[PDB]
């Protein structure tokens, strides 16, 4: 790695970058479409991902070294649905990512002398996979009806109050908290 | 259920609206210490039951009808240690508290003829059980040494970026977001 300015890679930096940017502000948008749903699990994983976003964002920007540059480069020119097809585009948007993207990204830095930043385009397509992965899953009870029901009993967490509640389904009315359904979540460990 | 106004149900409310207020407190406060002691997901959780606390205060608080009303009671004074100690201190008191305390008074809100409050003060307990747990099994990887390091192969999952790593350890540094180990926690799956 020399500098970058007026390499391709240049350009693929400040790309990504930029699409990264506008997908934080989406699934912070999608967020909020999903708390007003009733899926405030779901609300809250946007909005995680909303930040790793952030995150990836700020490893690549800190590559740059330059003043302004100009992209070329093609974006979802909206649009802010219900919750289930929210979780169906951004999945398809971290899909081209992960699939044609990045590894493209990845092998032209590798092609022109940049390794590391070439590791950094693999890494985060890996984060990608599982953003994917996530929102598929989501997208699929949503579709089956199993968000706040299950077919046999299990155990129930509010994510407001911390309740836990054993059932195949969550509570209408968390009795803690008296919060609604939509706080419930599967409980799980992860230690 | 009447007045409030008098009985003893409603010391016993303002009673535990007094330790839990604390206690959300001392666990914000546990949760930068591990922040600082370099274990992010344990500090994310500390903060979690911080934010749970202050919605059991809010729905007892709900029930006051009152003015002023003097409480005799004990309470930790202190202390801020390192982590494993905090996550030791904040069980006990858990314990404490689903074990004595809320069934106390939930036996007497019962037995002077409120019976809603009755059962918000036994699932309040139910939380205060699950906090406990996970206060514990937390508190016990760090004694073991497994906080970030398992014994077979398993996924790592960075908080920071969303980077998932394949190894019995998490890695030193994350590749994709370059923040330390610290930002690493085992990879959950809850729908
Ligand atoms: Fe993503
Ligand atoms: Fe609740
Ligand atoms: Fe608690
Ligand atoms: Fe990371
Ligand atoms: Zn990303
Ligand atoms: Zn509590």
């Given at each position: 790695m020399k500098s970058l300015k007026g390499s391709r890679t240049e350009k693929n930096i400040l790309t990504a970058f930029a699409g990264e940017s506008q997908a934080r502000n989406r699934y912070n948008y999608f967020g909020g479409q999903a708390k007003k749903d009733g899926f405030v699990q779901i609300s809250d994983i946007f909005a995680e991902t909303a930040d790793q976003e952030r995150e990836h964002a700020k490893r690549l920007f800190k590559f740059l070294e330059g003043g302004d540059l100009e992209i070329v480069a093609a974006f979802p020119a909206g649009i802010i649905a219900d919750t289930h097809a929210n979780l169906i585009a951004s999945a398809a948007g971290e899909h081209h990512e992960y699939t044609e993207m990045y590894p493209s990204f990845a092998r032209i830095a590798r092609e022109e002398g940049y390794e590391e930043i070439a590791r950094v385009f693999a890494s985060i397509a890996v984060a990608e996979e599982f953003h994917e992965k996530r929102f598929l899953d989501f997208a699929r009870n949503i579709k089956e009806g199993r968000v706040f029901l299950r077919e046999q009993a299990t155990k129930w967490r509010?994510?407001?109050?911390?309740y836990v509640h054993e059932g195949t389904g969550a509570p209408?009315?968390?009795?803690?908290?008296?919060?609604?359904?939509?706080?419930?979540?599967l409980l799980g460990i992860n230690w």
């Amino acid at each position: 790695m020399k500098s970058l300015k007026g390499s391709r890679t240049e350009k693929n930096i400040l790309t990504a970058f930029a699409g990264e940017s506008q997908a934080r502000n989406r699934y912070n948008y999608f967020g909020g479409q999903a708390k007003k749903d009733g899926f405030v699990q779901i609300s809250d994983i946007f909005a995680e991902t909303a930040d790793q976003e952030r995150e990836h964002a700020k490893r690549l920007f800190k590559f740059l070294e330059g003043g302004d540059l100009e992209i070329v480069a093609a974006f979802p020119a909206g649009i802010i649905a219900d919750t289930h097809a929210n979780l169906i585009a951004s999945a398809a948007g971290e899909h081209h990512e992960y699939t044609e993207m990045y590894p493209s990204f990845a092998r032209i830095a590798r092609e022109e002398g940049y390794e590391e930043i070439a590791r950094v385009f693999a890494s985060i397509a890996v984060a990608e996979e599982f953003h994917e992965k996530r929102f598929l899953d989501f997208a699929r009870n949503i579709k089956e009806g199993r968000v706040f029901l299950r077919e046999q009993a299990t155990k129930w967490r509010c994510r407001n109050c911390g309740y836990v509640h054993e059932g195949t389904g969550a509570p209408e009315l968390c009795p803690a908290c008296a919060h609604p359904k939509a706080h419930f979540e599967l409980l799980g460990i992860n230690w």
